[PDB]
Design a protein around this ligand. Sequence first.
Ligand SMILES: *[C@@H]1O[C@H](CO)[C@@H](O[C@@H]2O[C@H](CO)[C@@H](O)[C@H](O)[C@H]2NC(C)=O)[C@H](O)[C@H]1NC(C)=O
Ligand SMILES: *[C@@H]1O[C@H](CO)[C@@H](O[C@@H]2O[C@H](CO)[C@@H](O)[C@H](O)[C@H]2NC(C)=O)[C@H](O)[C@H]1NC(C)=O
Ligand SMILES: *[C@@H]1O[C@H](CO)[C@@H](O[C@@H]2O[C@H](CO)[C@@H](O)[C@H](O)[C@H]2NC(C)=O)[C@H](O)[C@H]1NC(C)=O
Ligand SMILES: *[C@@H]1O[C@H](CO)[C@@H](O[C@@H]2O[C@H](CO)[C@@H](O)[C@H](O)[C@H]2NC(C)=O)[C@H](O)[C@H]1NC(C)=O
Ligand SMILES: *[C@@H]1O[C@H](CO)[C@@H](O[C@@H]2O[C@H](CO)[C@@H](O)[C@H](O)[C@H]2NC(C)=O)[C@H](O)[C@H]1NC(C)=O
Ligand SMILES: *[C@@H]1O[C@H](CO)[C@@H](O[C@@H]2O[C@H](CO)[C@@H](O)[C@H](O)[C@H]2NC(C)=O)[C@H](O)[C@H]1NC(C)=O
Ligand SMILES: *[C@@H]1O[C@H](CO)[C@@H](O[C@@H]2O[C@H](CO)[C@@H](O)[C@H](O)[C@H]2NC(C)=O)[C@H](O)[C@H]1NC(C)=O
Ligand SMILES: *[C@@H]1O[C@H](CO)[C@@H](O)[C@H](O)[C@H]1NC(C)=O
Ligand SMILES: *[C@@H]1O[C@H](CO)[C@@H](O)[C@H](O)[C@H]1NC(C)=O
Ligand SMILES: *[C@@H]1O[C@H](CO)[C@@H](O)[C@H](O)[C@H]1NC(C)=O
Ligand SMILES: *[C@@H]1O[C@H](CO)[C@@H](O)[C@H](O)[C@H]1NC(C)=O
Ligand SMILES: *[C@@H]1O[C@H](CO)[C@@H](O)[C@H](O)[C@H]1NC(C)=O
Ligand SMILES: *[C@@H]1O[C@H](CO)[C@@H](O)[C@H](O)[C@H]1NC(C)=O
Ligand SMILES: *[C@@H]1O[C@H](CO)[C@@H](O)[C@H](O)[C@H]1NC(C)=O
Lengths: 50, 99, 423, 198, 88
Amino acid sequence: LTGTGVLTESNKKFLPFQQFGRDIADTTDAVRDPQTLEILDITPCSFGGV
Amino acid sequence: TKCTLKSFTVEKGIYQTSNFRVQPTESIVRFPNITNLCPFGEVFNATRFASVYAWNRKRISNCVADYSVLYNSASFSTFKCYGVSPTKLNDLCFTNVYA
Amino acid sequence: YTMSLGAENSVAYSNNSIAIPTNFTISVTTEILPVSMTKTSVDCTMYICGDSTECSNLLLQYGSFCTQLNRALTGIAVEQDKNTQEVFAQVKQIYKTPPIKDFGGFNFSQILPDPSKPSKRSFIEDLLFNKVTLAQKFNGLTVLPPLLTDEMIAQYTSALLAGTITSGWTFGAGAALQIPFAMQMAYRFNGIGVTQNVLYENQKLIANQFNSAIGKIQDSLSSTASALGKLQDVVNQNAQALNTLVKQLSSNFGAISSVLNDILSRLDPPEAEVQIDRLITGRLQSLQTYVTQQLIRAAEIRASANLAATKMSECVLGQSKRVDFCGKGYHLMSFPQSAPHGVVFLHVTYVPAQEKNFTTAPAICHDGKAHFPREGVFVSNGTHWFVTQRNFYEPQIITTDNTFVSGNCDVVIGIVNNTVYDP
Amino acid sequence: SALGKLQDVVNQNAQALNTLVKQLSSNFGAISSVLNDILSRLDPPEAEVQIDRLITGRLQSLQTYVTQQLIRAAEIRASANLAATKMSECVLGQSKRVDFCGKGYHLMSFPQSAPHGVVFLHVTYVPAQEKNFTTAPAICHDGKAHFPREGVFVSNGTHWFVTQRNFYEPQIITTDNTFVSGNCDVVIGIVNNTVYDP
Amino acid sequence: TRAGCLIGAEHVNNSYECDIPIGAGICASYQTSQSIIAYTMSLGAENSVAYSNNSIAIPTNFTISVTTEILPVSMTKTSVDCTMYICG
Ligand SMILES: *[C@@H]1O[C@H](CO)[C@@H](O[C@@H]2O[C@H](CO)[C@@H](O)[C@H](O)[C@H]2NC(C)=O)[C@H](O)[C@H]1NC(C)=O
Ligand SMILES: *[C@@H]1O[C@H](CO)[C@@H](O[C@@H]2O[C@H](CO)[C@@H](O)[C@H](O)[C@H]2NC(C)=O)[C@H](O)[C@H]1NC(C)=O
Ligand SMILES: *[C@@H]1O[C@H](CO)[C@@H](O[C@@H]2O[C@H](CO)[C@@H](O)[C@H](O)[C@H]2NC(C)=O)[C@H](O)[C@H]1NC(C)=O
Ligand SMILES: *[C@@H]1O[C@H](CO)[C@@H](O[C@@H]2O[C@H](CO)[C@@H](O)[C@H](O)[C@H]2NC(C)=O)[C@H](O)[C@H]1NC(C)=O
Ligand SMILES: *[C@@H]1O[C@H](CO)[C@@H](O[C@@H]2O[C@H](CO)[C@@H](O)[C@H](O)[C@H]2NC(C)=O)[C@H](O)[C@H]1NC(C)=O
Ligand SMILES: *[C@@H]1O[C@H](CO)[C@@H](O[C@@H]2O[C@H](CO)[C@@H](O)[C@H](O)[C@H]2NC(C)=O)[C@H](O)[C@H]1NC(C)=O
Ligand SMILES: *[C@@H]1O[C@H](CO)[C@@H](O[C@@H]2O[C@H](CO)[C@@H](O)[C@H](O)[C@H]2NC(C)=O)[C@H](O)[C@H]1NC(C)=O
Ligand SMILES: *[C@@H]1O[C@H](CO)[C@@H](O)[C@H](O)[C@H]1NC(C)=O
Ligand SMILES: *[C@@H]1O[C@H](CO)[C@@H](O)[C@H](O)[C@H]1NC(C)=O
Ligand SMILES: *[C@@H]1O[C@H](CO)[C@@H](O)[C@H](O)[C@H]1NC(C)=O
Ligand SMILES: *[C@@H]1O[C@H](CO)[C@@H](O)[C@H](O)[C@H]1NC(C)=O
Ligand SMILES: *[C@@H]1O[C@H](CO)[C@@H](O)[C@H](O)[C@H]1NC(C)=O
Ligand SMILES: *[C@@H]1O[C@H](CO)[C@@H](O)[C@H](O)[C@H]1NC(C)=O
Ligand SMILES: *[C@@H]1O[C@H](CO)[C@@H](O)[C@H](O)[C@H]1NC(C)=O
């Protein structure tokens, strides 16, 4: 999955079959980094509109 | 604010603007540790292929798929990909492959 | 069931019968209206372009459509501000809450703000605040905080309550005029059509009835927990609209997938415009539907808030002659209290209780000259005629001061022979 | 400053129209923004897709324009109703409503036409220079509790007088100014004072 | 603020009428040199009335006042010619 943004660490637990997760709007809530098992989620560069 | 209003003149008040002031500065790439070239079994170079009534399906797992060697090895007359573009296909990771 | 039209009642009309009430009841009626809705704003870049590399170019192509949509949402939000400004900001002159003193023997401890409480909300306002109940930031839809917070809205309601109790209608008209509360109630009885002696003779009974009605409102509000349903409906509708929008985020919209990241990753732009345009055009159309549903809701609550503003300026500020507008019955006053996303009204009103039949005549001929009552109607107890006001049975002897002389006795229909006293 | 509110409406109107001009500029996913070009460099059978994409985007901008107009129309309709109510209640008649036709007691109004609007010139009463007085709800004389008929009982502290609520015009307590009802014991706040009968 | 963080204006303890609706009890204006000022809500002037059960206030003078009330009536009538729009 390709994107633009910042990456923030998190401790969201996941089911055994899928380390990757999807949000309730089916957006990627968190995708696990391949080399490092730490949970890393995408946060936009643009926060709530100024 | 001028970009949002699409006018050089701006009136008095508060406005909400579309946020595109941030520009990308670097590109980072993360893929899992697999340095193994694919045990294709020379499926492309295999001496005998399957008949069409009994077609053979082979699982591909735990390798890094490189098509550059295949293009050098042989010229393919038909290369049609559906759902995934033929270009930037080498950028993308594939979940499960059954050739 | 077949829907019940109402209780069947009969009126025995006659050309010589009148019905005059002899006893009355002071009642308090609770009326709930909405003022403003939870303000919603859209981050155009996030919804159309969440973490997409080429979406900046797409923002140039389709962003303007969203920019217009945002202007509409901004308009709705900004309109909501005048809604509160059209309700709680009729009089900008803020009055200090007076120390609790004797108010005609009336009790206003529940509706007045509590100085012991750190919040300026009154006890009834605390009950309504508690009774009303209640990822999106990542989605790209955000909630705008209100321009007027609940504390200063409660301060506005407290100032208007203090003005209404201590000055009558005069606080709106420039500098206020401090008045006793019993005199204001008597003057409002004079406005309804009841003489001023009725209150001052029956002050304790009216005070006890008002206190009992206030107590009945207190417990009923807490026990029923259904009066605030209308306000909850507005909160529920806002929650539904948002939830239905974020559920519309979920579907793939007749494309390859519902995630634009995989659309960008799997495809290469020349065959990818088709998929990305179906996705973002469907998202923009869902946004367009959202705006329309918000627009009709905004109009609905604007109409309700205009009604609430008219109840600010015509019920709260002064007595309104219109019947069935300010509560039910003849309207004496109305107390406004703030509420989460709305306002609530306690209408103090006058209701006749015990009526009696009497024999009536349009006029009295005494010395060959016709007499007509200046105020009130003529009644008969059976032996001696009397003149009385319309909404209460107060018998008065017919004097030359009570009636005026006009015309002659033959042309009028239904006149009766009776004597007219002269002092 | 006062005329600014109307100007805003015009600017709001103008703003909407401006957007639609820009909204015709966007290609909306077409190969070319101008429809003459897609007609010129494309044979029809696949060009109809570009055509209905472009005109679908244009129509989309049209129904958004319609909606934005409808909310503005609603705001105008509400203002129109208010203005017609002001005409039928503040100008042609006198209004007992307070803060509906201006601050203070409303005397009358003058309407004046305005470009895309109207202004109301409210002539109104404002009390000023208020003064303290000592009051009683009723006056007892000869066992009769007289109640005031069209005014208040006030006192300069030497004699009691009757006057109007919105202006200080004291008058001597006469039998014509008051009406007799009940007895003096039942009323709270009774004050002994003679009543002078003409 | 409760709305967020405001940068570029100085907050004042003095209360003025809202010109730009920042929100959450904050509003901005342009005033004196000339700069953007931010302030809390001016709920209004504070006037104290003293209730007494035997007192009454009567004005002794009257002021005739003329007040502006500006109300919109209509906007510009806008139409579209259809075919020359969608087709050119
Ligand atoms: C009018 O109705 C009221 C009811 O509110 C009557 O007041 C009651 O009077 C009886 C007899 O003195 C008492 O036992 C009750 O306690 C009173 N009720 C209340 C609430 O105080 C009043 O008497 C009625 N007036 C007439 C003339 O019938
Ligand atoms: C006005 O009503 C309030 C009701 O809240 C009265 O306050 C209560 O008074 C009783 C005394 O009989 C106490 O037992 C309660 O604890 C009080 N409740 C609260 C919330 O304070 C108040 O006394 C009434 N005022 C008058 C003058 O009687
Ligand atoms: C109608 O009112 C008159 C006036 O009060 C009543 O006449 C009085 O009746 C009582 C008892 O019958 C006498 O003690 C009074 O002397 C009468 N007054 C006068 C001036 O004569 C009359 O009784 C009432 N009738 C009814 C049916 O209530
Ligand atoms: C009311 O009184 C008048 C007189 O004061 C009555 O008028 C008289 O009626 C009788 C019967 O028709 C005539 O013979 C007289 O000539 C009338 N007198 C005058 C001066 O016109 C009248 O009838 C009485 N009304 C009732 C209902 O008894
Ligand atoms: C209250 O009003 C009365 C009535 O005018 C005042 O009495 C007058 O006082 C003046 C000044 O001494 C005399 O010239 C008048 O003859 C008095 N009139 C009457 C009818 O007695 C009284 O002075 C006023 N008191 C105050 C404190 O203002
Ligand atoms: C007003 O005058 C009445 C009588 O002229 C006063 O009433 C008397 O008051 C005294 C003392 O309280 C009692 O002993 C008498 O029995 C009362 N008589 C009557 C007929 O009620 C009354 O006190 C006076 N009020 C004021 C404020 O001075
Ligand atoms: C009520 O107020 C008006 C002003 O609004 C007063 O008129 C002023 O009177 C003084 C003294 O006669 C003059 O010097 C001023 O020029 C007047 N003002 C105007 C605008 O003409 C009037 O005197 C006040 N009335 C009372 C009873 O105090
Ligand atoms: C991947 O392999 C490199 C050596 O090529 C090693 O340094 C690194 O720690 C490995 N990472 C993982 C995922 O174990
Ligand atoms: C396939 O076989 C040929 C010889 O027949 C060889 O030259 C070519 O490199 C092979 N390609 C591969 C490695 O699949
Ligand atoms: C008046 O008389 C009618 C008919 O006799 C009766 O039905 C009605 O109840 C009476 N009104 C009252 C208040 O008793
Ligand atoms: C009232 O109506 C009755 C109906 O029978 C009639 O007999 C009587 O004359 C009427 N009285 C008057 C004063 O109209
Ligand atoms: C009335 O008397 C009080 C007593 O202190 C005073 O504060 C107030 O200003 C007076 N009001 C007028 C109008 O004279
Ligand atoms: C007014 O209050 C005082 C005490 O503050 C009391 O003595 C007096 O009786 C009261 N008068 C009325 C009419 O309530
Ligand atoms: C304004 O309020 C702040 C709040 O902390 C205070 O520190 C400051 O001294 C006040 N300024 C003035 C001039 O009162």
